[PDB]
Amino acid sequence: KSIWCSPQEIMAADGMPGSVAGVHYRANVQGWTKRKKEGVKGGKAVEYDVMSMPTKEREQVIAHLGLST
């Protein structure tokens, strides 16, 4: 029921341009839900909850998927 996506999918969104940190800049103003995972087979893994982002932001995520699914 919960939804969590890594910054790679988010920064790949045209609505959210800039590298991974560039996305953090926009998320600096709003209190985005963030979680520091112990790294997934890597190191320092970060995820965001799209269900907590404004509805307008939600359209941008679905729109990116609408380009393929």
| Cα–Cα distance measured from residue 43 to residue 23, given in angstroms and rounded to the nearest whole number | 19
Give the 3-state secondary structure of residue 44.
Answer: coil
Query: Do 15 and 62 contact (CB within 8 A), yes or no?
Result: no
CA proximity to 50, closest of 63, 37, 69, 68: 63
**Cα 4 from chain centroid?**
8
The residue type at 18: G
Residues facing residue 42 across a β-bridge: none
What's the domain range around 64? Answer: 1-69
| Cα–Cα distance measured from residue 52 to residue 29, given in angstroms and rounded to the nearest whole number | 14
Into how many domains does the chain fold?
1
CATH of the domain at 26: 1.10.10.10
Structure tokens at 53: 């982002």
